[PDB]
Design a binder for this molecule. Structure first.
Ligand SMILES: C/C=C/C/C=C/CCC(=O)[C@@H](O)CC(N)=O
Ligand SMILES: C/C=C/C/C=C/CCC(=O)[C@@H](O)CC(N)=O
Ligand SMILES: [Mn+2]
Ligand SMILES: [Mn+2]
Lengths: 334, 334
């Protein structure tokens, strides 16, 4: 009758399976810079924006014309193995990538068709820049908590190959302005890869990691979006951490890991300083994989798992700031 | 303890407000045909595919470069007035259109920023071809039923102006093949427009229309998709009507209206015949507005409302078949 923060938390929702795919091809920032050198020389700009402002030494790309749906499909096959269940158990499949095969049909339907989902499986895509995987986890959690389904897949395949190709094209053209070139460099911090998660009703999966849910705040006055964006982003995150205290009971020192969406080395450094977070609890892959958009969060969770970095009882914070602006923060208990 | 169909229905979810926008400009199929006449003459094709196979006399377009987000915003302002609430009450805003301003940020965030949502409002886009508005209604319903929010907006603005422009360009070119021209004609059954709905917890809105929820079936083996598509579509719909009997208790003769997504005159005629539905309970706008994608369903519901066509207690079926293939069917009680 009297509301409490903890009442909105999911009680009966778990993670049965989790997998990621690293894209295979390394492209170093040194190789990109050689290609860009004469637009750099031409513009009278002497700074290595990628290596030294962004802090990206390399990113991963696909070796071939891999569609979003292909990479999600591959990640989804692995997470099913990880969970030890067949595709027939899946009642819901949500695709959360920014990369998309077509405006029609949804990417989710293509992935589902690849996996051979049953006729009872509901499917759709969610789009919300870099926070969508956490939005799809939440969506599936509600259906699970209610009993509408027993098992869900949340998938995300990202591909940036064509982005890099169109981008390096404009940036190495005699024509190009500084204001333009500068906008374009940020496309070069993106990376490729994929992740998938099998979520389930906790009674069907006893002792699996528990998905508690989370909180979202927004600052859509700034949907227009530079130097400003870091500041507004931190201010939104401060307010989401308050919400997270009110619902999840978070204080920073009680969390065992922060799985953070990452934009750049300086953006991450500022976030971490501003909230007093110990950097040893912030696994980072941006410097060699780049920004994998909404897949980043689950990829980093899956890497933590693979390295045996997580223990029963570990409180794990999933968070990011995304375009909109939006900020979400959720908790897993391993 | 023993599951029953009715257990999955939402008990506490209502429609507080509903509005639509008709796009202003009429483009007749006769005017399009004059432009296409020499590709028709050239191809040795003597049939008016638009007027006589599709059954579309006209469609509506925007008079200017209206973005999806602009049309959703306008529809959303009207549905708030209809509901008599201010934007501060809104805890969730989902955008469901196929049309999209950018791959980033979500269209939802742009709409929310336009309306001036508060910092507590969660936002994201759902994409699922023509069924997404019903998917967004369901998503919001779950959050409402649980008490996470009190009010939600589900919005959808569609724009086809650029589709028509690129399409009529390829179709009137000496170059063009029949197989190509034939693919392209179907883009010419699309229309523009928008809709928005305010959903709320039923205790906050006593006596408003009730959203019970619904069912989905899929046939994602056919995500590859002609003449076949009508048949597979009917077969999927048959199976969804079974699910709807099992959950909602539907029989065809007990429903007062069918608000059906519409693809074409013959597609609709076949659906209606195959299920024995009385055509007088199928309001249709396709012949003068064309296919408004996922906005079609709410637009037709809103038109029914406006005409005073609905009575307290009326059982209203919302349905469509969408790419994937997917089929969903949900019930409103006015
Ligand atoms: C410290 C945070 C600053 C906010 C920056 C947000 C930029 C977001 C991006 O452009 C991508 O990484 C992901 C995204 N679009 O959500
Ligand atoms: C009788 C049904 C036949 C199935 C046809 C589906 C075509 C769907 C479309 O192409 C659009 O109208 C909407 C959509 N993509 O969902
Ligand atoms: Mn290689
Ligand atoms: Mn006009």
């Amino acid at each position: 009758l009297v509301p409490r923060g903890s009442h909105m938390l999911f009680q009966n929702v778990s993670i049965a399976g989790l997998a990621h795919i690293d894209a295979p091809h390394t492209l170093t920032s040194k190789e990109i810079n050689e290609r860009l050198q004469p637009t750099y020389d031409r513009l009278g700009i002497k700074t290595d924006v990628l290596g030294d402002v962004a802090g990206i030494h390399a990113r991963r790309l696909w070796d071939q014309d891999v569609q979003a749906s292909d990479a999600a499909t591959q990640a989804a096959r692995k997470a099913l193995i990880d969970a030890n269940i067949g595709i027939e158990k899946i009642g819901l499949l949500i695709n959360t990538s920014v990369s998309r095969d077509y405006l029609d049909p949804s990417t989710a339907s293509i992935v589902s068709g690849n996996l051979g989902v049953s006729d009872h499986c509901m499917t759709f895509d969610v789009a919300n820049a870099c926070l969508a995987f956490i939005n799809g986890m939440d969506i599936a959690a509600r259906m699970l908590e209610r009993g509408e389904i027993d098992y869900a897949l949340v998938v995300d395949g990202e591909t940036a190959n064509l982005v890099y190709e169109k981008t390096l094209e404009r940036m190495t053209s005699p024509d190009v302005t500084e204001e333009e070139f500068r906008n374009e460099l940020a496309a070069l911090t993106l990376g490729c890869g994929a992740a998938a998660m099998v979520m389930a009703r906790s009674e069907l999966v006893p002792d699996a990691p528990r998905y508690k849910g989370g909180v979202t705040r927004s600052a859509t006055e700034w949907n227009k979006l530079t130097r400003l964006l870091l500041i507004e982003g931190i201010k939104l995150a401060q307010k989401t951490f308050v919400a997270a205290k009110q619902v999840l009971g978070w204080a920073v020192e009680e969390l065992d890991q922060f799985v953070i969406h990452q934009v750049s080395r300086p953006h991450t450094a500022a976030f971490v300083k501003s909230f007093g977070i110990d950097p040893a609890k912030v696994m980072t892959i941006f410097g060699e994989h780049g920004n994998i958009g909404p897949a980043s969060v689950p990829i980093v969770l899956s890497k933590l798992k693979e390295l045996g970095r997580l223990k029963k009882g570990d409180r794990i914070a999933l968070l990011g700031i995304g375009s909109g602006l939006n900020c979400s923060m959720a908790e897993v208990v391993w």
